[model samples]
Target chain A: LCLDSLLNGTQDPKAFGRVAVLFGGKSAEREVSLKSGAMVLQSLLAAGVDAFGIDVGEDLLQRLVEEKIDRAFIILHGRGGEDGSMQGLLECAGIPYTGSGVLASALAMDKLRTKRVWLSLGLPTPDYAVLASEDDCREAAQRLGFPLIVKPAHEGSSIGMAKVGGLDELIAAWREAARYDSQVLVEQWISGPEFTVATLRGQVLPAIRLGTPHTFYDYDAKYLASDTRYQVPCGLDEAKERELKELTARACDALGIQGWGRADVMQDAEGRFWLLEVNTAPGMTDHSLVPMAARAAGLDFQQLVLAILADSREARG
Target chain B: LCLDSLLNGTQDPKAFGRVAVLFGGKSAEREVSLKSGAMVLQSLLAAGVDAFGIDVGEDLLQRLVEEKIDRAFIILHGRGGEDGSMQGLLECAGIPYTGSGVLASALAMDKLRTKRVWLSLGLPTPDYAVLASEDDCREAAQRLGFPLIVKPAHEGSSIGMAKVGGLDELIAAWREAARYDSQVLVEQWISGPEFTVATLRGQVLPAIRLGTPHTFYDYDAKYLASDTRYQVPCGLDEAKERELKELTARACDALGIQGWGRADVMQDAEGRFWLLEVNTAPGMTDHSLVPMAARAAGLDFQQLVLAILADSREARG
Candidate 1:
């Protein structure tokens, strides 16, 4: 009921019961999830919570059965894990898992649906077009104009994303993105600083601005590239920073994002903020933006992880 | 590939292999699903397909493991069934199921997101607002005006839907629908004739115009009321019928609905057709609209079941 137990880690660990730090799912983002799961497992152990790691696989039901788990601390990322399949499985098993439920996870995993929901709610997001076919790619190029960003509709960590300067590249990029997903999304490129807000228990933490020398925040820039920069305080004035935080919170809430997650957004040259997407199960490695944002907000890694795990108690509807 | 084989039952029943007729889950519409599943199973058996029924429960994974099912014929109607949960389960289990996949099933399940997708593509749909809270209900009534219809966003069979003529009724309806689902939708009631279309493969069948004595086609009229009239030709002119068919096809394409499903639409006084929502798994009882439309299209119940099962082959991505 109070923030004291969350920050001070004074709550009884037995209340959490047996916890499964579910991760290492079969997806493109498996490696990242492994790192995240390991970090979370370590943090939960240090916080006196009964937590163990389980690398998710096709035999997830079997694993869940043998593990005798109570609640799930889902750090898994991407398709089979973050894309609502695992959430559905857990829901069927009657196991409370951290983050969003089936429809929310499915909606948030789909970038196109996420944008559609934001648009329906009158929220500010970038203009976009669906690239279902090659003809659609040409039409999108014509409608969205040149210099658009092409992204696979259902991907995380910017796995299959490209910035196209013209029609030729748009079609080519669409073909490439289509390999990862049947549905592709092309958006009018927003040329401005990108911000990611970590949300914990319906509260938006300090925003972090992402910067990289590459065309945009691609997969390499997100995990591999060392030159990529994460700026805390986000270089925005107090009022503007608050605006970004509020936007991120609203964006997450619009998508029914619950417990803990992350919201990716950008500010246009006109100084108006635009939502990119929300990650229901974002990376939780020590270097992850969520942990960094939590640290900036005065929560250490253990406190941050404990707070997230604690949220799982309420996530069970 | 030929219609001759489909209708004549010349296609080998062995091709269907072991099929699981999945139905009856933890939803408000479980009874309807049971009836639909029984009809589907009977038809499949009569058509010489090796089909068996599996009433879904908490031991879904256990049933899936022991049954050794080849593909799923999903007839489940609401929540865990018609929603994306079961579809996601099948996907994880590496089983090809009938109808739409996870994302499409999810999008179609949520009335709010379904309209958002249609709206993004400039599809004609009645204007509506979300009812997330009491404030949202007030705002929706103000924005959409009086005589609005309030319904649970994720429910099927019109389980928790009401036509409200005023703000007080709208808020009351919202509270009632919210009990069925956390998300509630309030739409400006379309004061016109309603129609239902059945889509098989990529083609639309004859449109069925629904008429009822109630304020709107609530649950009773859909499943229980014998007085509810169904017009095969829908009373639309040849040209108007073609337009409705084309609209239905496009609506299904927009949501990526595969195999066979049903679409609900309404025709305004101005003759403009507005898309209502799609059912990834519509009722399959003898009185169901899809079977009635199929008979109009020259396919018997058994033939219809066989054709839908055949479509499952190509539905698997």
Candidate 2:
């Protein structure tokens, strides 16, 4: 009843019938999800909760129905999981799960749509253009100006993202990003440090400032590289850090992101904070920025995990 | 199989396996969906396709699996089916369904989010403000001026929408809309006619101009009223009609709407088209606007139904 204790009753691990930790979806971020899901499962079980993992694919609904899960701890990233589909399946099954609802998840999963939400709210985000072909890349470069970034509209963990300074580089980056998603976003590059802020149940946690040797915070620096620097306290002045936190909160609210999530933001040299994207189901691995931020706010790994699990009841409202 | 012929083979009724005509969801528009779904099921059956109706409820996923449906013809409007959740469930079940994917459906379901996407894309939509309380209403009145429309952001069929000419009316309308949804949209009222344009796959069909005796088109005018006038050719001049069609297409593209959908647009006094909202799973009842538009474009009710079903192959991409 650890899950029940989190819900209504007092903590008792064995009383919780079935809790599914969904991860390892067939998205581009499958490996990242494997790490995140494993940590989540271990964290749940070690904290006296009966939980199991489901590497989701075609049999997702099959498994959910067969096992009759009471609740789901969604740790999957990218298309099937982080996008609204998985949330929908869980909703259809009437099972509470962690993170944002269908609309927020679907919106957050698409970088282009997320930016649109922020931009419409008059929030600061880099100017960008949608590229339909190589011809459009030059036009995008002309409008956005170089040092431009090309990104697939739907990929997670910055898998298909690249910074380019010239027309050829922009076209090359766009072509590669297009392999991941049909729609590619060519955006104005801020040539500044990126910060990620995590929120749990509408409260913003401490922020993490990232410095990487890679072109941007690509998949490698995000998950594999040890040299990537993560600065807690974010080395920002009191006013600036407060501004960043408030901006991140507003960005999350603008996207209708409830439960737990993370907002990636960029700070330009002029001290202006711009929203990059919102992550509804951010990485749960030990090296994830969310956990790092939560720890800085005085919550341990399991405390953060349990806190996320506790917020599952708030979905589908 | 008739469904396969629409997909790969030639037409045969019994050759097709199971196809679910989903409707009658647990939403405010359930009754509308019931009528729409019945027509859809009958149309599918009459056109030599194997299809069955499902009055969706808590047993949605269970029934979907138990029947092993090969595809879904989503006719349900409003909350559950028209929104992204049903599409999400179908995607997870690996069942191709008609209309836009999860993200588009989710964005379209929330009027606020749909406007954000259109606004961010620099598309013309009415200037609006989000109303959190009665105090925000006065400020909204100041910014947007008198004669405003208060609407629940999530409701469809104009169920909880009202025109407000004064602060008192605005407060009452907000109070009424807030009952249907916590997030209320207080938009600048357009003192002109309205139009509904339907799209089949990527092609925009002929538009239908809505003329109502009520303050604006409500549930009664949309579905129940026999006296409400629906003018084909939208009565716009050749040039204006073309502009409306093209604007509808752009609006759909702005929201990433694929498969098939409908866009509700308003023409202000100055003759500018403003996007109202999108209907991903628009009603399929005999009197519905999409079918009426399709008929004006030389496609009958059954033809439009089958065409929508044919486009099911393009979902969840």
The C-alpha lDDT values of all candidates are 0.84, 0.83
Model 1 CAPRI quality = acceptable
User: What lDDT tens digits, residue by residue, belong to model 1 across residues B30-143?
Assistant: 999999999999888887888899998876877876787887899998878767778877877778888887777877888887897788778999899888888998888778
lDDT of 1 at B7: 48
What TM-score, over all chains together, does every model reach? Answer: 0.86, 0.87
- Give me the candidate number with maximum DockQ: 2
Tens-place lDDT per residue, model 2, A103-146, is 88988888887786676678999999998887798788777788
Against the native complex, each candidate's DockQ, computed on alpha carbons, is 0.40, 0.58
Question: What TM-score would candidate 2 get against the native?
Answer: 0.87
Candidate 2 total steric clashes: 2
> In model 1, what lDDT does residue B277 have?
94
Candidate 2 backbone collisions, by pair: A1-A12, B5-B9
Candidate 1 at B17: error in angstroms? 1.9
